[PDB]
Amino acid sequence: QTQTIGRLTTPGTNLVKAYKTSNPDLNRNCYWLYFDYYVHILGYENGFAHVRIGTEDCWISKDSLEEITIPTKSVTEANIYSEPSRTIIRYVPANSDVTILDFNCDGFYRINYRGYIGYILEDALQYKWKQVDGANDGERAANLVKTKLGCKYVWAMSGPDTFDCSGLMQWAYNRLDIFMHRTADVQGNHGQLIEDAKDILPGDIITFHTDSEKPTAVTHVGMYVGNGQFIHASTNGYVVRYQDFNSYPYPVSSIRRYWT
């Protein structure tokens, strides 16, 4: 499928309602999407853009996002194929200036090279769309939140500069084209369940019971980042901060793995 790149702009605010069809009851949105998130644009219809995050697709107002392209230079000669697979369309010298139109196409960017359109290997271009390093998406997610240490706590925010506990998680996995829902309790009910804290890995999310007088309730979430530490947007300082996993005095509800 041919797709373009969307960056949410939500003019004048931080959120836009999402719907599951192009003719919705505007009062019955399935959830929201947020400022500076990234999506694949599937198409347009009835004033809405059809967007996709990983395995999730929904509809948002065309005014809430902007279609964008990404220029970069190549660092490794390779062939621009007609689809993300090594019919040849052209060739890219040493470091040619190109323009990316789509990403994460089974290892292949979709680009424009001096007027020629097609798919090129990800590692051939200087720009790396995940931004961070890591052995798997879990470690990448962990390194993404580490970049946010010190960011201030604000309710209902998901970046780029302020966060609440659940927004930090959804922001991090949106940067990896992996969708999770917005609230802590829903996040803790999806992805692969890790029943054993000794088996946790960076990028795994942890939900917690933080109210002793409502001990089954789930309002708070963090992400394991290795070495017995997790990171969370916390009201204990109103900041994104490290937290010692073992001495944290609030019980775990679930450990969930959204990376594969």
Residue numbers in the entry: 13 to 98, 101 to 274
Text from the published report:
We report that T. vaginalis has acquired, by lateral gene transfer from bacteria, genes encoding peptidoglycan hydrolases of the NlpC/P60 family. NlpC_A1 and NlpC_A2 consist of the C-terminal NlpC/P60 domain preceded by two bacterial SH3 domains. The NlpC/P60 domain adopts the classical papain-like fold, with a central β-sheet of 5 strands displaying an antiparallel arrangement. Hence, we concluded that NlpC_A1 and NlpC_A2 are dl-endopeptidases with specificity for the tetrapeptides in peptidoglycan and with greater activity toward monomeric muropeptides.
Their crystals diffracted to 1.2-Å and 2.3-Å resolution and belonged to the space groups P21221 and P1, respectively. As expected, due to the high sequence identity and similarity (90.2% and 96.4%, respectively), the two structures are essentially identical, with a root mean square deviation (RMSD) value for all atoms of 0.491 Å (1,379 equivalent atoms). A single-residue difference in NlpC_A2 is located near the active site where Leu169 in NlpC_A1 corresponds to Trp169 in NlpC_A2. The tryptophan residue narrows the groove around the active-site cysteine in NlpC_A2. The remaining sequence differences, spread across the protein surface, show no obvious cluster of residues that might influence function. The theoretical scattering from the structural models with SAXS curves was consistent with the arrangement of domains present in the crystal, suggesting that the NlpC domain and SH3b domains pack in a concerted arrangement in solution. NlpC_A2 was recently detected from the T. vaginalis secretome.
